[PDB]
């Protein structure tokens, strides 16, 4: 579109320096789900509501509480 | 390097490898002190 329209491919501008770094959050709008051992959707995305830090709440610990 | 890749609607990623040498020298001179020095010749990682 802006980089495309009728021109060189959408990756014409850069030099692709961003060797995909090793860490989570290199996926812009993935509805990254599935906290480990928890089907509950953890992240609405990696690009929102992450200023506030981890829920840090109770996931499945029940035997210890009893 | 500039690659020309036919389009895909799903955002793949290129996976390039620079073949190098990844030797290792394992030295143990006492009753167990395993000392090793690493050396990757072209793409060295050493301060």
TrEMBL record, chain A:
Induction: Expressed in the intermediate phase of the viral replicative cycle. GO terms for biological process: symbiont entry into host cell. It is found in: Virion; Host nucleus. GO terms for molecular function: hexon binding. It comes from the Viruses. One of its GO terms (cellular component) is host cell nucleus. Keywords: Capsid decoration protein, Capsid protein, Coiled coil, Host nucleus, Host-virus interaction, Virion, Virus entry into host cell. This protein is only encoded by mastadenoviruses, and may therefore play a role in mammals tropism. Homotrimer. Interacts with hexon protein; this interaction tethers the hexons together. Self-interacts with adjacent proteins. Interacts with kinesin light chain KLC1; this interaction leads to capsid disruption at the nuclear pore complex during virus entry into host cell. Belongs to the adenoviridae hexon-interlacing protein family. Structural component of the virion that acts as a cement protein on the capsid exterior and forms triskelion structures consisting of three molecules that stabilize three hexon trimers at the center of each icosahedral facet and fixes the peripentonal hexons. Dispensable for assembly. During virus entry, recruits the anterograde motor kinesin-1 to the capsid docked at the nuclear pore complex thereby subjecting the docked capsid to a pulling force. Three N-terminal domains of hexon-interlacing protein form triskelions between hexon capsomers. This is Hexon-interlacing protein. It comes from Human adenovirus 26. The gene is IX. The chain holds residues 2 to 67 of 134 of the full protein.
Automatic annotation (TrEMBL), chain B:
All late proteins expressed from the major late promoter are produced by alternative splicing and alternative polyadenylation of the same gene giving rise to non-overlapping ORFs. A leader sequence is present in the N-terminus of all these mRNAs and is recognized by the viral shutoff protein to provide expression although conventional translation via ribosome scanning from the cap has been shut off in the host cell. This is Hexon protein. Induction: Expressed in the late phase of the viral replicative cycle. Belongs to the adenoviridae hexon protein family. Transmembrane segments: none annotated. Major capsid protein that self-associates to form 240 hexon trimers, each in the shape of a hexagon, building most of the pseudo T=25 capsid. Assembled into trimeric units with the help of the chaperone shutoff protein. Transported by pre-protein VI to the nucleus where it associates with other structural proteins to form an empty capsid. Might be involved, through its interaction with host dyneins, in the intracellular microtubule-dependent transport of incoming viral capsid to the nucleus. The modification Phosphotyrosine is found at residue 38. Homotrimer. Interacts with the capsid vertex protein; this interaction binds the peripentonal hexons to the neighboring penton base. Interacts with the hexon-linking protein; this interaction tethers the hexons surrounding the penton to those situated in the central plate of the facet. Interacts with the hexon-interlacing protein; this interaction lashes the hexons together. Interacts with host dyneins DYNC1LI1 and DYNC1I2; this interaction might be involved in intracellular microtubule-dependent transport of incoming viral capsid. It is found in: Host nucleus; Virion. The chain holds residues 903 to 949 of 952 of the full protein. It comes from Human adenovirus 26.
